[PDB]
């Protein structure tokens, strides 16, 4: 019974696993954030078979469904009611996300206003 | 593989194919007629 987007095409992801950094499973000091390996002998860098995979532009997402949420919208962070009224005329393609640091008192006004304007809110039930 | 695409390029393909279909059906009939005549002749 939620607000629906103008269209809801099929979202295709060329990949869903994250790219884990080389050897980030072997040490705690190596975080999983990706880093382009650059060792001379690095077998990940040389693209040996069965090794960790490197990101490259080929994995890029379709321009038509890029950044699109599972609901079919695209999010836009808002901090108050005034910021919410920009989405008045793109309410069938962009939803509202209320910033984490907005007090519970101010959320009710935003969540109420968005209901009047038919703007979708991704986190309407938070800090209640 | 697509008849109407071929005609947009070579309209005379339609004439060629029609003649082939008719010539091949005509040729098939004769071979059947010539066969029946020989078979009846053998029966005699």
């Amino acid at each position: 019974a939620a607000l629906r987007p103008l269209v809801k095409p099929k979202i295709v992801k060329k990949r869903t696993k994250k790219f884990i950094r080389h050897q980030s499973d072997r040490y705690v000091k190596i975080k999983r954030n990706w880093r382009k390996p650059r060792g001379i002998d690095n077998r990940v860098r040389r693209r040996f078979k069965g090794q960790i995979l490197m990101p490259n532009i080929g994995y890029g997402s379709n321009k038509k469904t890029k950044h699109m949420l599972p609901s079919g919208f695209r999010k836009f962070l808002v901090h108050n009611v005034k910021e919410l009224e920009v989405l008045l005329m793109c309410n069938k393609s962009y939803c509202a996300e209320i910033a984490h640091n907005v007090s519970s008192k101010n959320r009710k006004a935003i969540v109420e206003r968005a209901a009047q304007l038919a703007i979708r809110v991704t986190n309407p039930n938070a800090r209640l | 593989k697509n008849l109407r695409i071929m005609l947009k390029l070579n309209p005379y393909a339609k004439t060629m194919r029609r003649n082939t279909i008719l010539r091949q059906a005509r040729n098939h009939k004769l071979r059947v007629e010539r066969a029946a005549a020989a078979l009846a002749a053998k029966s005699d």
Partner: protein
């Protein structure tokens, strides 16, 4: 007043429709003529040989004027001379195909790239199916599928090549404008031979694939086209 202008518009549209209609009859009759021409060429060679045999002599047919060249070897480790000759034939990729009109200048080039090509003499059906299924024009330096006769007419019309049949006729008979009509065609991108090859690394006469296999190129063209 607008009624007068509309008439002018309708009449202009009528003229274009008639010009289009008469152009269709031209290419329709051009194909009818080439069909007769091809039949006479085919029947003529048979009649020539029959009369030689009748007299106890030998009829030696004309050496073929046309060849279809296919690149059968990759791009790793090619000697500088072979590499330059393959680019001049426009066979820059494996299983690329081109027509070549034969003469002392070109036959000696084909000898240099002998280990890297399979070539032979294509028959009329090969020229047809090649250009129809895999015919792309080089129009404004782009690869355009020949899905419309206007594509041929705009580029090669000045040489009176205005339809696929004219393009097939110029290539097959090596007309006076073979060079232009042939370079207009993009190198044919053929598929891997369905059924495999014998041995790409040796000559055809050795039981391999490279070199001149004469009319046996047609069997290869069917499996790749």
């Amino acid at each position: 007043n607008f009624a007068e202008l509309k008439i002018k518009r309708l009449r202009k549209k009528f003229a274009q429709k008639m010009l289009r209609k008469a152009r269709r009859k031209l290419i329709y009759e051009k194909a009818k003529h080439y069909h007769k021409e091809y039949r006479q060429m085919y029947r003529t060679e048979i009649r020539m040989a029959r009369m030689a045999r009748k007299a106890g002599n030998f009829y030696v047919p004309a050496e073929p004027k046309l060849a279809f060249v296919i690149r059968i070897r990759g791009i790793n480790g090619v000697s500088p001379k072979v590499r330059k000759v393959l680019q001049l034939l426009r066979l820059r990729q494996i299983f690329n195909g081109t027509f070549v009109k034969l003469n002392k200048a070109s036959i000696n080039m084909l000898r240099i790239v002998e280990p890297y090509i399979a070539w032979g003499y294509p028959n009329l059906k090969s020229v047809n199916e090649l250009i129809y299924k895999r015919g792309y024009g080089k129009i404004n330096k782009k690869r355009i599928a020949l899905t419309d006769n206007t594509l041929i007419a705009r580029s090669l019309g000045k040489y009176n090549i205005i339809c696929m049949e004219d393009l097939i006729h110029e290539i097959y008979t090596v007309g006076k404008h073979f060079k232009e009509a042939n370079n207009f065609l993009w190198p044919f991108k053929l598929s891997s031979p369905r059924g495999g090859m014998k041995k790409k690394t040796t000559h055809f006469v050795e039981g391999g694939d490279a070199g001149n296999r004469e009319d046996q190129i047609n069997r290869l063209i069917r499996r790749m086209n």
